[PDB]
Amino acid sequence: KWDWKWVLGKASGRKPAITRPRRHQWHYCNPEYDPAAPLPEVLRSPFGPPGAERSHDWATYARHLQLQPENRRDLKRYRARFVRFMQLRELDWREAFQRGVAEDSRVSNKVARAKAEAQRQDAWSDYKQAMWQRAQL
Amino acid sequence: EQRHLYLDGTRTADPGEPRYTAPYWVPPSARAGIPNILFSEPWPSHEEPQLRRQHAAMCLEALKRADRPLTAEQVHEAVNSTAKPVLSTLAYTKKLLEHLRRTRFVYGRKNPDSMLSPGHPDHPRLYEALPFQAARYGKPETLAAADEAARAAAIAKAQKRLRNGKAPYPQHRRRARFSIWQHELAQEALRELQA
Amino acid sequence: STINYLGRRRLAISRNGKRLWWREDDWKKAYVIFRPPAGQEHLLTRQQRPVIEQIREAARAPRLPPRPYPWERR
Amino acid sequence: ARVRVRLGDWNRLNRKWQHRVSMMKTMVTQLLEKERIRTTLAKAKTLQRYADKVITLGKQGTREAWSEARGIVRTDRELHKLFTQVALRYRERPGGFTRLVRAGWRERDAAPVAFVELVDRPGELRPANPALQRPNPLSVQAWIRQQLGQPAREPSPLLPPSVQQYLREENRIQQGR
Amino acid sequence: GNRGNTYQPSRRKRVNRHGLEKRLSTPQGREVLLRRLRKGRWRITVDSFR
Amino acid sequence: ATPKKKLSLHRRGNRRVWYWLKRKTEVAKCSYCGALSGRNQMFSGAAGNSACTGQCVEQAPTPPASSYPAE
RNA sequence: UACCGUACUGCAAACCGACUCAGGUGGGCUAGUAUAUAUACUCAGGCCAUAGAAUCAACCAUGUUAAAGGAACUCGGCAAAAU
Ligand SMILES: [Mg+2]
Ligand SMILES: [Mg+2]
Ligand SMILES: [Mg+2]
Ligand SMILES: [Mg+2]
Ligand SMILES: [Mg+2]
Ligand SMILES: [Mg+2]
Ligand SMILES: [Mg+2]
Ligand SMILES: [Mg+2]
Ligand SMILES: [Mg+2]
Ligand SMILES: [Mg+2]
Ligand SMILES: [Mg+2]
Ligand SMILES: [Zn+2]
């Protein structure tokens, strides 16, 4: 459903003049955008969970407006705080994705370097034993 | 199977000391015209990490089987006497035991009749081998006393912040740590243990 | 889905150099999503690969080069 | 303002000293990874002196030499090359492991440009000279090197026949422990 | 204090000062507009567009 | 710190003597490709010379060597 | 369940200063050693394009160190040093 080289920033995309989409425009700047596919209930970004779409966030709004009856003093300020929370959560999903991918890549390169050194040492030992063996012969 | 010369001879090489990988022994007056790389490579051999992990595990299991304060001499002899198979020198065993103590896997106590001020590194130490890795390094009674002092200091700072126009504790915004990477990493972990 | 566009600016330099500037008439672009007419619905017409492998391959991919400058030769 | 050229010392290369040492470490790592690099004359001369120091440190082959080169030399793919291929290649060479050929000026700033390459390799531009030159025992030099305390210093294979009678022995193997 | 930057742009203030309606609100603003017409200016006010 | 009069064409020419370049009395010319450079500089194909045909170096045979390629 | 905004930039080479101007420009979010949004190193992320190349001029700017003294300098310990 996503073209991940474009998502990580290493490939060109559909509508290449955008280069920084908002919450909407992720769906249409995707290079793998299929028009025949149905349109999701919430139209989320990547970097968020698969359960983040098909889940209305206004249940949170009504829930914390109902059980706390003193949030009804300034309702417009409350709605502004909720919308600010929504954008902030979309940013925190991106930050968590970036930290997870970086921490994966660190140990992958850290393993591959030791594998390369093991290959180099096991290649040197063969040459050294070859020299001493031909000195024997 | 993991047995290597020291380059001095008359010993075997522990993981972390120079080996001798030349196939035939040559004396140093004789080897004077040969490049030094053709006897010992100057780099670690890429198996000393795994052997060091195995040797530390055997040192812990020997300390675990005998639940007695067990100084470096008998833990070296105890690891050696289970099958010169392992632990060629006391210095390697001391290096392993101090690393295990620094990672809170074992701890140290004074040695009677050879105290030598126990903070002096020449002092022989008694190893107890606590069962789980501790979150902190000190005696748990002293850690509890320090936690009570720190908790009272936290209450005092909060009260002083209340006399001034501030919150008792710093109020921080709650964050979101879940993402697509963590969900997919969970799926990979569940399939990996599932197989 | 409708998008409002400005006209394109046009430059048509004159017999004496003036920089005559024009502007096309503003237009609206509509994105119309259609639906299959009657009984013909088969023409929506579209193995697997793990998305963990997709992200791990797209993280070890080489980066896009920085954009060259219009005077720069590469 | 301290005098570096005219009073034999390291070049400044328009840089602070920590930047200067880091740039030389990067260039010596690049010089041994690709055996011929092209740069300005001042960096080329400084690279030639640094290459002689680093190559001799690799020729020692000791654990302290490996530890010192581990900080000096960045790649680690090429730390192996310095201690194995370069050390065996120049095992008997008394310095001068690198040559410099001037190559004109570069387009961006008209700075003089020199080619710096390792000698005695397939793909070098001038034939090397042998590091040693076996002496005639019936010439004046050999007798001067007998009356005065000089060694023979003859050309040698990697393992001479003087170790053959030790390595042939089946009681001097120890089975590999 | 460096000078020269007296023009702080704002669309609300620009339209509210030099727009058509404040020019038409007063008589002398209407003769300002009338002599702009008599001069022959292509742009009558700062907010005119089509 | 300011000229009091206008410099004449003769005085300007006399003052501009430092700006002129000296002619070089030697050149190294490749007989094949007709290239031109200093006698201390390589000017073959490895350096900038799109006209090089390799005839500038007339002999280069070096087949034998033996070493450990580190891989 | 319509209409308008949605590109790009936004401490800045894209705004206000004639400039690719060392100036001015509002609000919000944030990881570790660690402990404060201060301080040193670092995470995520970003950057090392807008003159380059060597070298020992004098001199200028900004600093480091200095033997024995110590305001004797100077309109004035100004400036530095010092706590
Ligand atoms: Mg719209
Ligand atoms: Mg100077
Ligand atoms: Mg520094
Ligand atoms: Mg101010
Ligand atoms: Mg003005
Ligand atoms: Mg600023
Ligand atoms: Mg100005
Ligand atoms: Mg500016
Ligand atoms: Mg830093
Ligand atoms: Mg620059
Ligand atoms: Mg003094
Ligand atoms: Zn030619």
XYZ file of C-alpha atoms in Angstrom, chain D residues 90-159:
70
model
C 57.632 -3.781 1.627
C 59.095 -6.136 4.306
C 62.701 -5.351 3.268
C 62.371 -1.810 1.829
C 64.332 0.900 3.719
C 61.728 3.670 3.312
C 60.625 5.385 0.094
C 57.447 3.300 -0.340
C 55.744 6.101 -2.346
C 56.573 8.130 -5.492
C 55.262 11.559 -6.576
C 54.615 12.610 -10.213
C 53.417 16.164 -10.945
C 50.291 16.326 -13.126
C 49.759 20.034 -13.921
C 47.148 22.332 -12.346
C 43.486 21.838 -11.401
C 40.627 23.852 -12.941
C 38.881 25.254 -9.828
C 41.817 27.191 -8.353
C 44.956 26.679 -10.569
C 46.696 24.785 -7.730
C 49.639 22.527 -8.692
C 48.585 18.842 -8.787
C 50.680 15.742 -8.045
C 49.997 12.014 -8.484
C 50.998 10.022 -5.383
C 51.204 6.240 -5.662
C 52.642 3.171 -3.917
C 55.749 1.742 -5.640
C 56.439 -1.974 -6.453
C 52.865 -2.956 -7.382
C 51.226 -4.223 -10.598
C 49.826 -0.989 -12.108
C 52.655 1.371 -11.041
C 54.065 3.876 -13.585
C 57.853 3.419 -13.243
C 59.737 0.156 -12.553
C 60.825 -0.069 -8.962
C 64.347 -0.720 -7.873
C 65.061 -3.775 -5.687
C 65.138 -2.839 -1.967
C 68.361 -4.891 -1.562
C 71.166 -5.471 -4.121
C 72.959 -8.794 -3.422
C 76.668 -8.033 -3.003
C 79.565 -9.547 -4.920
C 81.815 -11.154 -2.230
C 84.718 -10.390 -4.645
C 84.264 -6.568 -4.579
C 85.462 -3.634 -2.413
C 82.042 -3.070 -0.735
C 81.942 -6.595 0.781
C 85.444 -6.224 2.307
C 84.548 -2.768 3.702
C 81.415 -4.477 5.146
C 83.685 -7.202 6.673
C 86.338 -4.936 8.280
C 83.590 -2.529 9.461
C 80.633 -3.888 11.476
C 77.955 -4.182 8.767
C 75.510 -7.080 8.258
C 75.222 -9.038 4.992
C 71.619 -7.717 4.391
C 70.982 -10.019 1.375
C 67.700 -10.292 -0.607
C 65.526 -13.032 0.947
C 62.390 -15.078 0.240
C 59.447 -14.703 2.681
C 60.578 -17.844 4.547
